[PDB]
Design a protein around this ligand. Sequence first.
Ligand SMILES: [Cl-]
Ligand SMILES: [Cl-]
Ligand SMILES: [Cl-]
Ligand SMILES: [Cl-]
Lengths: 161, 162, 161, 160
Amino acid sequence: SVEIKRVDKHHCLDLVGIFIELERYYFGDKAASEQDLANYLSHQVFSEHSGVKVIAAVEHDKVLGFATYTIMFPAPKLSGQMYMKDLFVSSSARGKGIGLQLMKHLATIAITHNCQRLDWTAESTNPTAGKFYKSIGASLIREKEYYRFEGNGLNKLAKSL
Amino acid sequence: GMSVEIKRVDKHHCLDLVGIFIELERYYFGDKAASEQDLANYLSHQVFSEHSGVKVIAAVEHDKVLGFATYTIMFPAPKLSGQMYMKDLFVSSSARGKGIGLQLMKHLATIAITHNCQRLDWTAESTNPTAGKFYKSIGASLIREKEYYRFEGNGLNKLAKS
Amino acid sequence: MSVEIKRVDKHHCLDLVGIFIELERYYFGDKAASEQDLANYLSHQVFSEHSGVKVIAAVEHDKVLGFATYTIMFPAPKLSGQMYMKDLFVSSSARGKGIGLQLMKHLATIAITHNCQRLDWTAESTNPTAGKFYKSIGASLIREKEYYRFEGNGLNKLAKS
Amino acid sequence: VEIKRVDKHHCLDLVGIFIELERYYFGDKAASEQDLANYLSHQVFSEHSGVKVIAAVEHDKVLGFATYTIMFPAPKLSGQMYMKDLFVSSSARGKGIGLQLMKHLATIAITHNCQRLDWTAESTNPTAGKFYKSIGASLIREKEYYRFEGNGLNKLAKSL
Ligand SMILES: [Cl-]
Ligand SMILES: [Cl-]
Ligand SMILES: [Cl-]
Ligand SMILES: [Cl-]
């Protein structure tokens, strides 16, 4: 019924529809145009310097949701740590458990590529997500502290080189 | 030139990281640190592999590695940009007070802004307060809203099977 | 509209055979290369370990309407790259759809997201309409630039001496 | 004096000569050593770079370099080689280094099916023009050089 597959570079534009939806959801009026996103997809998301791969859930030739993930090193027990950057399910596919299916699929990739961990973050201002994550058996790692340089802070650091 | 050099480490020279990795394994895992032979395979077959998403830079002096960082660029992110993420920063205890950690991060920041990233992110451990102070001291921000989730070992296998 | 701009990679390089056959007629008429020669050229040269260019194309109904080849050169001022467009070609059967300009909008976007402060290219003074098009989209003619060349025998001699 | 390609594992061998190039063109605005090491490591030598770098070395010192790319399509089913930069250390003047680098490029050009080696010079640098003509190069007068940059380049990108 609903298939999950990895999207390769030759089909990256198949993701445009769903990224537009993601853009509108997260940024509203500041959402990027379709040509912007096509360019972003072809030369950034699917560039040589991109650390992520992309999987997508497809039903009747339409994308219902996607996740991006990377495998990082080093990690405990001589293995990889998988990290999911984004999980997104179309409002039009809601109620079908798409997100769970995407995460089960990610879990499958993790074990076949010697990862013992699948990690990701959520926002505390989106308590729904955490409830969902907790409901599917995920553990919240309270000891983890998340740091960031950005905008001008990031620039000042770079310039101090 | 300069005494301490920062350079990329590529697949062809990955075994140059064996010394520093032994030191890292002892730090994180004490008793359970991996052997030299196992670290060499880890490096050659996993850290530098088709499925690996990280790259590595290292601080080098006198042909010994004093510290390294692994990093990757993740998508999507706001403003049609990338999000750089540093998986590990590790500096040898013998290279302490040489400002290697900051040096490595300056290079990371420069890579970030020349490769369409507007963020550089990473995590630290609350059990390692010293890291937190160091990061805040160089002007890093703590993102208190972020919640870190995980599946591992058996839970990961259950999730995959089900 | 139904026109997509996409990257062409090595695995799909033969998609360019049709538009290369057109480009060959346009510049060389009867001295145009055969289809077989162009497939070999695309497979063994244009996409090759020694090739310094990438390719984006405008495609509609699985037909290539136009393409641009480009590369990023170093060094250049301000610790940045310099993008160079080798060729821009739009099929006579796809004129009036603003495809040339759209291909350039994409290149410009790749340049600024990959630390380039310049997008450069050349035209022929014997092809006045190209220069007019370029000025009309805001490009500057760099009159101080002098273009030099070794070719054929002179090239063979330079290497041999 | 030996001429050979610098690969990524040795890109930092070029710091010295790059520093000199920066002083020579940008005077006080010259980038620092670390800036240059980072530039070489992650841009000049990156998967998105179109250039390779050859260097002339004598007694383990870099005396000069050239960067070049090979572009397509071009006439007669071949590549057109393009030299982006040629630089000779002032401390190696009078040794014919510039000429030696170009003969080497020519050798690369003919073994990779390029019928052409092209490059540009600045008319405000007549000595460069004179030198090129003197080694057999032809000026292609019909060539017009166009550019978008800075704000103009941004505006074009933003209209996407
Ligand atoms: Cl969230
Ligand atoms: Cl390698
Ligand atoms: Cl023209
Ligand atoms: Cl010049």
